[PDB]
Design a protein around this ligand. Sequence first.
Ligand code: DHE
Ligand code: DHE
Ligand code: HEC
Ligand code: HEC
Lengths: 539, 538
Amino acid sequence: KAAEQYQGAASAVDPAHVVRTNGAPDMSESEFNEAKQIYFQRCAGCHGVLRKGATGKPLTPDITQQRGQQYLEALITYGTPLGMPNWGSSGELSKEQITLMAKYIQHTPPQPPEWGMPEMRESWKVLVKPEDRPKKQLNDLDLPNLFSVTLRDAGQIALVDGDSKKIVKVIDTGYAVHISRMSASGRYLLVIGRDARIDMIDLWAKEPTKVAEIKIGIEARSVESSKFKGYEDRYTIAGAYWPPQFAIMDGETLEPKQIVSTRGMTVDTQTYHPEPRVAAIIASHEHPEFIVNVKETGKVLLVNYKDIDNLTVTSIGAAPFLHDGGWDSSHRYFMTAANNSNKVAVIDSKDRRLSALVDVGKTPHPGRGANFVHPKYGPVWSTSHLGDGSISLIGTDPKNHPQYAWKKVAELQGQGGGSLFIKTHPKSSHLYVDTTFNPDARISQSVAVFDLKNLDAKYQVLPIAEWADLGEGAKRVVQPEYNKRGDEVWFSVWNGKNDSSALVVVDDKTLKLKAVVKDPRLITPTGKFNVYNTQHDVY
Amino acid sequence: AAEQYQGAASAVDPAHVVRTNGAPDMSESEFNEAKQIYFQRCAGCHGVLRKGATGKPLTPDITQQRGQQYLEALITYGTPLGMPNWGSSGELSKEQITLMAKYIQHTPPQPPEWGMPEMRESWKVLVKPEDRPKKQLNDLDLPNLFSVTLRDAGQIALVDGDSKKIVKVIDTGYAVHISRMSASGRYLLVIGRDARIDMIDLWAKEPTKVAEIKIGIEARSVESSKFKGYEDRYTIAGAYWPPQFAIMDGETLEPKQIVSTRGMTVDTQTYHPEPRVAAIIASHEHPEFIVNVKETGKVLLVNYKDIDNLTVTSIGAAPFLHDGGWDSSHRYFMTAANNSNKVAVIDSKDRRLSALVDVGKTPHPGRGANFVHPKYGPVWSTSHLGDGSISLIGTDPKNHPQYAWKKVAELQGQGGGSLFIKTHPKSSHLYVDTTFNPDARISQSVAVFDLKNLDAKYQVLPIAEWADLGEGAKRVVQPEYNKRGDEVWFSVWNGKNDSSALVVVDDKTLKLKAVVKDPRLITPTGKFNVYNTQHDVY
Ligand code: DHE
Ligand code: DHE
Ligand code: HEC
Ligand code: HEC
């Protein structure tokens, strides 16, 4: 009873300032659930689970009820020229459905489940123990030249032989794998689906097989392996969209070790954000750390794995909406993009600080970027954009080129906006740029190629989807990817689930069609990752 | 283009995202009546989001599972495991208990957040550092000044140690919880449970407030940088709500950084939406702050060498971290995980957890009592709320590795409800209060042990009786020494409409020495001697 009186006083919190949420328009279970289904299929990706993910005002009840039924139905119907699509004018949703959505966003956001250690371990499986695994490569495949390709809708991935252009093995994975990464030893291929399910693949088995699996959240996009000297296959890290967290696992078995929440204060307004999605993750070569990108709060975390029992995290503030990115030629500066902020953040991994914030085009989307030596400006890193057809070239040499370091030194012009990936290779004199989400079909089905030896000349357009000879379908071309020796660049002809797709290979030296990969199993091919280039960050 | 890029379906399954309800309808006045009772009477233990107490949380999934009558029966008779009986005792009516049962079946109302805009709005520089004196402009013996908390008055009082007279009363935040000193010994920092901080300059003609700021809706702790070369550099405060801490300029109180403590627990490793910040202590080994996060049981080492890019080492300990203090050497932070009945040892030099020592029912050491035991070498002690024991823990890894991090011995006091144990380098006595003991006589007195003869039973000093105050609970709390170490002060924490006092004792003879009374001395709780607080002398 002593301890009961000890903690018996009043909370300093004023009841009058703790508010009950409601005053929303009534809707039955049938109605409520219909809107909710529409919400996650059509709105969630941009607005988030708790409705604070997009730019502009959040869709939380304090704002929506203020605007009211009429204003909301009107906005959802026509959209806005700032990124909010029109759902009525386009015919996407009915007026009845839009009325449902306007009612829906006036209610408190339904809560998705959390996903801690018990859920994680439950989902964790070791298909093949480290003791039962081969001591050496048991197949005669040229693993470095293998291409891990995502059969998106199929929920699988395909290993494709670089030289033979044939599918060696198809593997079952999590739905719509987003990226593929290689372990520092070059033996394990890691893949993670948007459903947060990670699969570990042993390339040394007679036939490449899965040795371990785990689910690290409800939704996810990234995975990475420890690449610091003396830590080959030590730790594997993965970031989730929901819950706002990342998890560190055992490199050999994928055993859950640490789970860290990214919920926190933003870099810009320094206010609490309840859902800071984890974006890109890259492993440091300077220190035993993982460089994690936290989107909404716009934070770059340096997570030290030298001692995972007592995690040390350095939080570097950058700019809101961090997404993708990659290393500079030297592998010390993490050139990442804050897309909605129209900036590229530069993270000095050695000194562990924000080297600079570079102003670029509308909605930069570099992927891992493209590094090359410019005749006049020296070592540069480049990116294309979704908001425009420009290509930003940034100087990346502080030591021997202070005049150009962290400056948008020059621009190039491609086919137009809607670009996703820019590419090049050390042995190549060409720079590729795609246009996957360009509203023009011809431009979306082709790629622009620049001449590094003559950057003044306009690009050449390579008709990739046409070369494929596929037939009907949108046939969107996406992500150029070189092979081991960088003498051929690969592309994905991302056609529908019920249509026909292909991977088109081009001779880098002649810019001529070299081959086309077709297979009934090659369903919705998207990302392609060449083992050697992925593992050694060659781009 | 960007609209098609981010146009695919989210990987989250709509069928697993749940709408809350199925709660008993209650009008606006009924919900508000319940909500008021909940923060006046329940929140302290259960918390804002109802996940702060042991046992099952009071969230809709559980409360609706138990049902209306189960809840009414539980709130009415309580449980032997820490849940008070509100009906049986007669505290709440059956009509109110019915409202409470219905209330916790609804989603928890949400309190506002509190970020940088709110912080800067509340931030006030009263006297600019340039406009402040360059020397001490008064004749006060600052090191022997006591900062006393006049709880219900929302003020503190500076009492001259030798004269026993109130030197100045200052308006502060409501119910200040602790007083802390800047490393230079010039500024006094106080923080109210309402999260309002006040910085006081002791060098001014009359010690006065130079700055103030509010770092949350509810808080308890504050601290200053004590690493060499960092005097008055930064000030840190921990909040209960929102679940966070903030770092500010140690000269102006300007908010610089705010860090959320919401996260994963150390035991179950699941997400906890409300991990309150408990004690905070400044490191002498590195340029860091050692922060306790209660519910997740984490001790964070927040480095301030580069305040722009904050680096935090997260150390797991045990759930329900609360109060704690240094060992005689000032390298090991001895902190109590009260509900876990353990004392965590954080090595601030090597930056790791040295041990988890099993102690008694609900440890509550305050900052603890350090003293060299004649047999077991240097130890750090603590008393409890749950029982009448006093744990003695060895703290000497070098010269006494056999006793290091072991509950080496045990002393017995008057009983439970204890809150503070105390001693001093120059003293040979060990004091222990028993503030929340259900017996009036025990709670109005303190026990004293002879450190030169620990086998001998304690003496009982009738502190409240010595005060001669008349009616009231007259609960005595927290022993405190003067700089010389020859006087020990106690607070007679009576009601606000009653008479209170500060009883001072001759440590050398254990005889009454002085009694401080004043119409202004309302509900005197914590007392912090300037020097002893600044140099962590305990
Ligand atoms: C955070 C993130 C990364 C960086 C990973 C890293 O390196 O750690 C990334 C990379 C990638 C990469 C990496 C390529 C590389 O060369 O590194 C690929 C292939 C890719 C295929 C697609 N991405 Fe990606 N992508 C998102 C997020 C991300 N994508 C989205 O949230 C978004 C905007 C919406 C969505 O529906 O997921 C999105 C849409 C797409 C697509 O439309 C693609 C083409 C097909 C798909 O599966 O949705 N994203
Ligand atoms: C986190 C915390 C600390 C350590 C801070 C530090 O050292 O940096 C502390 C210390 C303290 C100290 C520090 C003394 C010391 O020697 O360091 C004092 C005097 C004190 C007076 C009280 N505390 Fe305290 N206390 C709480 C929290 C805390 N108290 C509570 O939440 C609790 C259990 C419930 C409440 O009502 O707030 C509580 C009740 C009390 C009381 O009942 C006291 C006697 C009067 C009051 O104002 O509530 N607390
Ligand atoms: C990204 C590709 C989006 C998708 C898909 C949807 N919305 Fe959106 N929405 C988006 C942006 C960037 C903005 C900002 C608009 C601006 O000009 O500032 C919005 C805004 C809204 C709003 C208005 C909020 C307000 O200002 O009060 C609403 C009500 C809204 N969006 C609704 C909504 C719904 C119901 C959607 C799916 C059916 C949806 N959005 C999808 C970006 C995107
Ligand atoms: C601490 C001093 C408390 C105060 C004040 C109140 N409660 Fe409590 N409560 C407390 C504990 C430690 C526990 C666990 C007890 C156990 O034996 O497990 C509880 C539990 C409850 C419950 C039952 C929860 C369940 O198991 O379903 C209820 C319904 C409950 N407490 C309600 C509640 C209310 C409404 C209170 C204020 C009027 C309240 N508690 C105060 C600790 C504390």
